Amino acid sequence: TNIENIGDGAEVIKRTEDVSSKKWGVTQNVQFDFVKDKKYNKDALIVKMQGFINSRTSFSDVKGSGYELTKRMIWPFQYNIGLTTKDPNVSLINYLPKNKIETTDVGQTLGYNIGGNFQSAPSIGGNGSFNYSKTISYTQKSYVSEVDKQNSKSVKWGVKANEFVTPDGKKSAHDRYLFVQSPNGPTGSAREYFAPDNQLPPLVQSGFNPSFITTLSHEKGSSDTSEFEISYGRNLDITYATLFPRTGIYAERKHNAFVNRNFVVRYEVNWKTHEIKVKGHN
Ligand SMILES: [Cl-]
Ligand SMILES: [Cl-]
């Protein structure tokens, strides 16, 4: 189940890697599909990036005197998915999502026909008019997807915090009092200073399950192997909630406190032997 006939003297060699990190709280479940097609004089690798990026959300006390009633909530303001390469021989010919998509569910399809013909569709609908297709699918309740950077050598997506449903209407990702609440007593736990799990969406509470694609073209001839990095990470904001007994709760946001905390894995493609292997990581 690692080689598939897609029509003609054309087939797809399916390879997959699974690299994880407890430090970064990330898991890369990538699928590297090589496109073998005599009628298309260029190597092509369809990389489908999946896995899990831990929200890394944490509620805790704040050490130091004068802060006994100041609690801290750390959460992911944005998830980061990206793939960059340096080898001159390689170029990114396509990527999904191609444009900014802000619906709760993201479902797109990358199609391929013999003769090097790729086309994308922002829907997982019909209708098998491709020799081979790969699809992305992920939910982002309260978040928005956008292509931060892109060129022939790299692509980088960002799943940003956008708007959240609250007991009292909507609230933006920049609202300083987002997720804060009085804990019903000064003896209340750190967690009680913030919104309960039922009001927190998956991307905040649990984490994010990425699902992205990007095809790489390669010039046949003394360009035997290429390397590229894949980043899965997040940008974290801090939300401090201080209880003034008998008064109320004072909150303050520290936006972009921990940016670019990413887990970068370096891979190598052996175009000739149609094979993949991990060179290293952080
Ligand atoms: Cl698929
Ligand atoms: Cl209050």
Author numbering: 30 to 311
Would you copy out the relevant sentences from the publication that reported this structure?
Leukotoxin ED (LukED) is one of these bicomponent pore-forming toxins that Staphylococcus aureus produces in order to suppress the ability of the host to contain the infection. The bicomponent pore-forming toxins have two separate water-soluble subunits, one of class S (related to the slow-eluted component of PVL) and one of class F (related to the fast-eluted component of PVL). The prepore is composed of alternating S and F subunits and is able to assemble a β-barrel pore domain in the cell membrane, producing the mature pore that ultimately induces cell death by osmotic lysis.
Indeed, LukE targets CCR5 to kill inflammatory macrophages, dendritic cells and T cells. Furthermore, LukE binds CXCR1 and CXCR2 and previous studies have identified the L3 loop in the rim domain as the binding region. The crystal structure of LukE provides insight into the residues required for receptor identification. We argue that the structural features that determine the binding of LukE to CXCR1/CXCR2 receptors in contrast to LukS-PV are dependent on the presence of glycine and proline residues in loop L3 (Pro212, Gly214, Pro215 and Gly217) as well as a different distribution of polar residues (Gln210, Asn213, Thr216 and Ser211). The fact that loop L3 in LukE is one residue longer compared with the same loop in LukS-PV results in positioning residues Pro215-Thr216 so that the local solvent exposure is higher. Indeed, the solvent-exposed surface of loop L3 is 1750.8 Å2 in LukE and 1472.4 Å2 in LukS-PV with a different charge distribution.
